[PDB]
Design a binder for these strands. Structure first.
Lengths: 137, 64, 52, 89, 141, 63, 70, 57, 75, 191
RNA sequence: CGAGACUCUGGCAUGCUAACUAGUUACGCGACCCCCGAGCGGUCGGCGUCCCCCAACUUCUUAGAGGGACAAGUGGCGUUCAGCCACCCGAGAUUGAGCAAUAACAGGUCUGUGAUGCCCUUAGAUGUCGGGGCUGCACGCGCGCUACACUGACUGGCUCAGCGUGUGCCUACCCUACGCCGGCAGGCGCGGGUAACCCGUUGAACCCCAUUCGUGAUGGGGAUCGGGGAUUGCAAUUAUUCCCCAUGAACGAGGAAUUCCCAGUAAGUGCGGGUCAUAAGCUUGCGUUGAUUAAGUCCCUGCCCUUUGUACACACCGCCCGU
């Protein structure tokens, strides 16, 4: 019966009680359920609680660990982009900046005219799998 | 219009009628009266000696 | 069915191979000798030097 | 709520029912004459003729003039007919 | 007694706590970010479970004539979600199970013996029985 | 309902009853063995149906 | 798990009776047989029911694939 | 066709047979198919004893 | 179908309401408490776990899926 | 134990059948008392067999319906045992007595069977067998409990308990009662 | 003649004969020995390994010969017959396959067939290698699969199986206990086993349990897409496949319509085998958890009985008329 602590920001979304902390965070892009769960474990925060619980302190501690993942022993395999294509590292991409890179890669392979690029642009299915009577109604 | 509820007990399962064969004729001893004994059709499976709760003897239930 | 139209009809054949062994203990040759003779067709019989 | 002082209709009261959805026996309609109280139409009596038609481009949001047969103030069920209608046009 | 006579759920919990008291479990440099098994759709709640697993493994080995990684992996294993295909059995993480076997061996709860893999140590036999007694008084369910 | 006797059973039964009247009993078990002695019947189910009907016949016959 | 429960119950009651039938006395075993058999649970007579064979042209034993018709 | 069938059928029956049947199938007389059955004796198709009792080629 | 949500913040007023409504209950489960208040269902549950260290509620089930509490001994 | 065979934490004693027409398909102690319901898992072996099965066992069986929940008796036994406890807190009493009352009040008397009459929609008023009245009642009540639980916080145990109590003495918040009143009303009418 | 009968499988044989590629019992039981409990303790009971016999057995396990079901016993009913109903014993006159006549069909197949007629082509191939497509999607259909959640999503934990199968093979090759490393995919070292010896005491999934979540498209759901790691192959581009993370769709119960189902059955649930260098959302069996319901009838439908009518006979999807 503790209100009191409420209204937390992770990146560009308002995070309040609704679900357990981990799930609450995943409003933003680049943070799945598994990502937010493992960040909280690293940051020594009980993740069973609500996001209308916990103060501003805990939030900042989460933000620092997510955006410096290697330097807090979140390994390279766990990352959304490994080695990347723009950047020679290994970067966790979050929020609006994921949308940027997705656009980049699709444009990139239209220039280079690679099969992935062309198919996606034309609206054909990028994977070689059937689209015979599927990929519509 | 209205009559009192009559308990009547299955004396003899007469056989089965119905177009699909899913209506069973029954003769029920009127229980209150041994003089009356009247034929009413039961929808369910009937085992002799079980008791119906007749709400009418109006609108006689009969072969079809 | 060759050429599959119609209905799904499946055929299942079995073949039931039967095995048995018998361990005799007694001396060397006269075992395998007296046993393996007097039979020729259609039932395999193997006499094995195995077991000490 | 409703404009009327009484909370329920009576026997052979002409009402207007909003057909919300068709399901099983007929339709669990809402009497709009008296608040939004639940009632039902068909199974036995409602139809006056059969011609094997009852809609084509008659979609939804529509409404039937009906008359009250049986009303259960306590139980909240109102058995309704449209077959009864003649001066209730 | 065998360990089976006493409450199984209470046994593993009591033994797991006894392991914590010992002060070592030779813990991995993983289990803080892990996938774990592929039967999991969410990363582990805590890093506590390693003790519980160790207790469980010790109990399982006590039953058998000796066993290694394979036995633990099937028990912890369950149904694996294959996406939009049928769910089917699999065996998950082998690094953790191997690590648990090594760690228990280090404490001398279990040791290598005949019939392959680790079988119980008399040191472990004594430990398991002491917590078995505590459990035996507590309930039977 | 099902498994009403066939002609093959009844014919054999008539045969046996006429020519072995004094030997035959009224008990299934003993008659079943008597049918082994006085005939060659290539199945036990068939022999049982024969034996069976022959007891039923003997019971009627001895009235 | 359930299969085993039913089996064990049958074997334990049968066990007791079996022991008393050859060694102790008939009246004890008979008393046990009376008490059980009345409400009944088939603990001294075998259950016939074992799996029925699957036959082709269906996904189940008696279940059969959907047909399609114009 | 009939002469050939009758001679072989009669000879096989004469050797000792409970019965026998000879079938000639295929086309004759251009573009229509025909079958003929030339049967004598007893023949079964019933259950498992058919496999045992009758030899076919 | 349906759309229904409850407050997912642990609140002041609803805890107080709970303990001072206590003669109403004789059956208490998470779901009941949740419906009768606006407390979550999860935080229904948890409020009960707190409440049980008054001992205005007594455990009579302890099942994994959901728990059943009594109010006092029997009411 | 052999003196009286109780339920697994409730009594089979003081269970009264409040109707004289529904007898011999309502039982719980007229031979058929059990700590744990289970006969042999067949009930379709004979037409005789249904009489053997008491109302309690029939209620557990009817519950497991809708594909995922099919063929899970162990889950249902746990849910049902919990449900009895929920009934006991809510009304005191014996939960089995509440169950029996609920069946009697939910069971219809007259219903209707189809009869031809010009091709117009008319039906013949008929009474139905007490076996049918019990079978239909148990169906209605299980379906009611499941229906509520589906998109609501309350579990099957709680909704089943609520469904029985409302039917036991009328409240008009029980599905089974509402359906029965429709069936009997329609029966009276007709041709 | 078909079907019945018959055969094969499933169930009833603490009777019969056997078992060291199988186990069980039963001591004496001692040791690893824990005291968990009793006993002061020796000792007794105990999941497993180990002690093993000139032990005993076939109960579980195996497969051979044997018996048991015939409506037998009894009671009602019926031409007192054929048969029917109940009752006992109990596998009950309640299992599932295998089995096909007379005759039809322009059913399918020349691409299973060095079976085959005629025709085409044939050194310029329609006889072989290099490359691509079958995998392209504004849309219609079918069998499925995954779903719509709380008998569930989630995190620990408990725990019981069966049918079958394997390398050392006549054009290509295994299952893996066990050691180590890696979240994982996977990598790497051994040893046994053509096998009830070894994989595999097949300790599988459902199930059971203490939580978390709280009915909210929510974490139900895993669509689509992006980045990366590996495995298979000489070759994966048009993801062969597998894994790791992120991106996190419709769908919250399905209209017109329509399939299948009576008991270990429907439904839930895993497993083994086949295809195979790699590749299962497939199919064939198998065990597990396991209902509600007719318990009947000919209404619709289909098929099969007499009678009757027919301008029908390539047989009503026929015929058959006038403008």
């Amino acid at each position: 019966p503790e209100k009191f602590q409420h209204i937390l920001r992770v990146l560009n979304t308002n995070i309040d009680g609704r679900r357990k902390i981990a799930f609450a965070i995943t409003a933003i892009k680049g943070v799945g359920r598994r990502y937010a769960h493992v960040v909280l474990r690293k940051a020594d925060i009980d993740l069973t609680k609500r996001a209308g619980e916990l103060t501003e302190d805990e939030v900042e501690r989460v933000i620092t660990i997510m955006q410096n993942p290697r330097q807090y022993k979140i390994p390279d395999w766990f990352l959304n982009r490994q080695k990347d294509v723009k950047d020679g590292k290994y970067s966790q991409v979050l929020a609006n900046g994921l949308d940027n890179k997705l656009r980049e890669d699709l444009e990139r392979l239209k220039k280079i005219r690679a099969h992935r690029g062309l198919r996606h642009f034309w609206g054909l299915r990028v994977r070689g799998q059937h689209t015979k009577t599927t990929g519509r109604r | 219009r209205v009559q009192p509820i009559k308990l009547a007990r299955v004396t003899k399962v007469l056989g089965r009628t119905g177009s699909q064969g899913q209506c069973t004729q029954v003769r029920v001893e009127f229980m209150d009266d041994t003089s009356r004994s009247i034929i009413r059709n039961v929808k369910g499976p009937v085992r002799e000696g079980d008791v119906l709760t007749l709400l009418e003897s109006e609108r006689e239930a009969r072969r079809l | 069915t060759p050429c599959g139209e119609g209905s799904k009809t499946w055929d299942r054949f079995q073949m039931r191979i039967h095995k048995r062994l018998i361990d005799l203990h007694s001396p060397s040759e006269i075992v395998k000798q007296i046993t393996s003779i007097s039979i020729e067709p259609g039932v395999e019989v193997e006499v094995t030097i195995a077991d000490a | 709520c409703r404009f009327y002082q009484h909370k329920f209709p009576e026997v052979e009261d002409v009402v207007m029912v909003n057909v919300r959805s068709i399901a099983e026996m007929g339709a669990y309609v809402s009497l709009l004459e008296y608040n939004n109280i639940e009632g039902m139409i068909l199974l036995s009596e409602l139809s006056r003729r059969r011609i094997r038609s009852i809609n084509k481009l008659i979609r939804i949001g529509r409404n039937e003039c009906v008359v009250v047969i049986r009303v259960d103030k306590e139980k909240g069920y109102i058995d309704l007919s449209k077959r009864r209608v003649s001066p209730e046009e | 007694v065998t360990v089976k006579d006493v409450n199984q759920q209470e046994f593993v919990r009591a033994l797991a706590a006894f392991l914590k008291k010992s002060g070592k479990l030779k813990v991995p440099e993983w289990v803080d970010t892990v996938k774990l098994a592929k039967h999991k759709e969410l990363a582990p709640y805590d890093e506590n479970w390693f003790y519980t697993r160790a207790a469980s493994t010790a109990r399982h080995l006590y039953l058998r004539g000796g066993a290694g990684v394979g036995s633990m992996t099937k028990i912890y294993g369950g149904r694996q979600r294959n996406g939009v295909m049928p769910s089917h059995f699999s065996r998950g993480s082998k690094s953790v199970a191997r690590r648990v076997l090594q760690a228990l061996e280090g404490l001398k709860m279990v040791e290598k013996d005949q019939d392959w893999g680790r079988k119980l140590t008399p040191q472990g036999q004594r430990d398991l029985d002491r917590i078995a007694g505590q459990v035996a008084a507590a309930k039977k369910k | 309902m099902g498994r009403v006797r066939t002609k093959t059973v009844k014919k054999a039964a008539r045969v046996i009853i006429e020519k072995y009247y004094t030997r035959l009993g009224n008990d299934f078990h003993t008659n079943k063995r008597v049918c082994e002695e006085i005939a060659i019947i290539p199945s036990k189910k068939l022999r049982n149906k024969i034996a069976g009907y022959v007891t039923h016949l003997m019971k009627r016959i001895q009235r | 798990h359930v299969a085993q429960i039913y089996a064990i119950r049958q074997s334990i009651s049968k066990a007791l009776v079996a022991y008393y039938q050859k060694y102790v006395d008939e009246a004890s075993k008979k008393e046990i047989k009376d008490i059980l058999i009345q409400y009944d649970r088939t603990l001294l007579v075998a259950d016939p029911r074992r799996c029925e064979s699957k036959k082709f042209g269906g996904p189940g034993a008696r279940a059969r694939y959907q047909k399609s018709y114009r | 066709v009939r002469r050939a069938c009758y001679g072989v059928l009669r000879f096989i029956m004469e050797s000792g047979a409970k019965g026998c049947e000879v079938v000639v199938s295929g086309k004759l007389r251009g573009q229509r198919a025909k079958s003929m059955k030339f049967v004598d004796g007893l023949m079964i198709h019933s259950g498992d004893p058919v496999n045992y009792y009758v030899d076919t080629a | 179908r349906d759309k229904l949500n409850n407050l997912v913040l642990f609140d002041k007023a609803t805890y107080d309401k709970l303990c001072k409504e206590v003669p109403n209950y004789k059956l208490i489960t998470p779901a009941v408490v949740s419906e009768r208040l606006k407390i979550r269902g999860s935080l229904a549950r948890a409020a009960l776990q707190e409440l049980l260290s008054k001992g205005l509620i007594k455990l009579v089930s302890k099942h994994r899926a959901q728990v059943i509490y009594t109010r006092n001994t029997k009411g | 134990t052999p003196d009286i065979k109780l339920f697994g934490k409730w009594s089979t004693d003081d269970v009264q059948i409040n109707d004289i027409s529904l007898q011999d398909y309502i039982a719980v102690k007229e031979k058929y008392a059990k700590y744990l319901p289970h006969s042999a898992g067949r009930y379709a072996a004979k037409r005789f067999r249904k009489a053997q099965c008491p109302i309690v066992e029939r209620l557990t069986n009817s519950m497991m319906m809708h594909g995922r929940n099919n063929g899970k008796k162990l889950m249902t036994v746990r849910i049902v045992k919990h449900a009895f406890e929920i009934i006991h807190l809510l009304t005191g009493e014996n939960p089995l007595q509440v169950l029996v009352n609920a069946i009697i009040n939910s069971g219809p008397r007259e219903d209707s069977t189809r009869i031809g009459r010009a091709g117009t929609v008319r039906r013949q008023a008929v009474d139905v067998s007490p076996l049918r009245r019990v079978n239909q009642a148990i169906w209605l009540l299980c379906t009611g409990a499941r229906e509520a639980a589906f998109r609501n916080i309350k579990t099957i145990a709680e909704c089943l308990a609520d469904e029985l109590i409302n039917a036991a003495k009328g409240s008009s918040n029980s599905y089974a009662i509402k359906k029965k009143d429709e069936l009997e009303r329609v029966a009276k009418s007709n041709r």
